[PDB]
Write a protein that binds this ligand. Sequence first.
Ligand SMILES: [Zn+2]
Ligand SMILES: [Zn+2]
Lengths: 353, 343
Amino acid sequence: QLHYPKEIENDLMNCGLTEKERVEILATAWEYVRCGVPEFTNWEKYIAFVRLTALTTVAEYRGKLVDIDRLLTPGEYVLGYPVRELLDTLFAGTSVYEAMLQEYASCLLFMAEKTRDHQSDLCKKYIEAIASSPSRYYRLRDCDAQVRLFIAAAVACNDLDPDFTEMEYQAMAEIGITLYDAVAFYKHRAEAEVSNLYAYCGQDLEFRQEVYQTARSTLWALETMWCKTVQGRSAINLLKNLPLIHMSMRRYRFVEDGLTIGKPETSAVVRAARNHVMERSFESVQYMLYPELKEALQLPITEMCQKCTRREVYGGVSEEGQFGGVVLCKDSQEEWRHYVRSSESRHLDWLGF
Amino acid sequence: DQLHYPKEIENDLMNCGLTEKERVEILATAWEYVRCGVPEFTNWEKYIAFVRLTALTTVAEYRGKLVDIDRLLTPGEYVLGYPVRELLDTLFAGTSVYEAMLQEYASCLLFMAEKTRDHQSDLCKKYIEAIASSPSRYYRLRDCDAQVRLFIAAAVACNDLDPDFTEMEYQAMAEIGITLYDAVAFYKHRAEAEVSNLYAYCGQDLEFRQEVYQTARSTLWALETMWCKTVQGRSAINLLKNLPLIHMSMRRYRFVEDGLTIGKPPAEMERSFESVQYMLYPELKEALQLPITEMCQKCTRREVYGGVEGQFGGVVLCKDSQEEWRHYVRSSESRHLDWLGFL
Ligand SMILES: [Zn+2]
Ligand SMILES: [Zn+2]
């Protein structure tokens, strides 16, 4: 049986979902928020955030249903949700308000763009931006996985105003993504995903084990330094639980894989992948794009490495073991591997240890 | 991977029988357990006391011959540099669970030290036979061993509140937590011929393990949905939910070393019942005095437990006893929904 609060039990009715899909989305949204934000004080903001995480979950599953251009419009209901009102309840009167409005809209925009019928030019530029540098992969994946959004929401649901610096958010995202992308590796590869750190860094277990161990070690140093503050614990709770959801949430396949993690041949998500089978402009969406994404989507073709292998159209069918975007050259792949292996110096700098 | 813990504990357990590597592994392991089990707290003083109590628990697991079990509950006494009874008073004194938690702590460390003596004591054999006598008894004794109700009570105390769970809430929570934890620790426990694993008794087929892990986790999500708005509710949730997850979150476990995977297959005068009975909680006092006439005679018992492939080190249940255990674990939903006040 799936469980979630009565408050949300009638959400997402009459939106194009089966009763099975709808109850799975609501349970997933609730579990994600409980796992990522276990400590809260404000129930009204907590439920608003659960509802926004439900819409995010719909955007990932069936993005065609979500009117991206209405998410930030006051008075507008998207699949029954007053999205801008929920964002205002959560973030209005905090220092991160205007930035989190663009973070939310930008995340859902590219979730919808990636499910689309045919590759848009926004999609193609995103696919090439994330392959263009490791720091740009981490910033854009941060938005895609809602890392800094969850951290700020966690602080807001404790009735405090987030005061992390830009470099603290970048350190937190690099730790969380390095862990999460490692555990999701086999699901993401079986689905020929573009948004996985190891699509660019390399598929060898030895690299993954090494940088996982370093990120978890830095996270334990961060936890030891920050655990006496509510804001500190709000960031720790979110980052630490990112990989653990593979075991804690009923959306993942821990039980169905024989109580295993990291074994692709017993995996229910990999076996599902194996068994399986009107154009938004930069102009129309720029109001909602955060600055790093705007620059990411306008990087000149010529200022990117010309040795890496791009294509006209990404997606379509691929062999077992292949991810779905830009294939880095040896020099670029060496650049990424070296950036990730250097995390400890960069982060002890960025986090103020 | 360097080890991290607070400065308040960094020079504990100095020059008292641990190697230098052992001592820092113990302090880091205690800190990591307490941070995973009790993520939400308000009282730093109580928190460090509990971390130090966990460090001593960790010495008893590893090196129980260093630990003077009979001085744990004695005012004024230092064990390995810790004023154990002062630490337990800082954490629990003036709560409704004070006396129960002194006994819960001492009873845990007593059997951790008994399990590693060179010679099996009488007391150790009676524990090994008691934990195999009924599934409800397995869960209560494993609760103390794993410190499930002690951690839940400590979590509430570290939020400056008075634990007010009922006996039957503690029993449901222990059943949920142990069913999950013993499942994830299954292969490690089997490799060490452990006695304290639910599946040593229920059986070793993966299908039973999957099914009852799915139910326990589903119950825990219903409990979390019902209780997540109070500090006491979250204190319980956080401990139970994180029990299986420490296999990924703690450096003590082998997630990384295993390829980012879970699941991959007479120095000593003997203690007597009478010398330790003051420190035992009621159910353990009773379990250690059960006549083996009142136990199932068809189960396979031994004169001496231990020695030795893919075998646990205690009582081997008979087919009928195994069926009783499996039925009990598979009936958890109804028992738990009743004990937890969902109906
Ligand atoms: Zn290149
Ligand atoms: Zn029997």
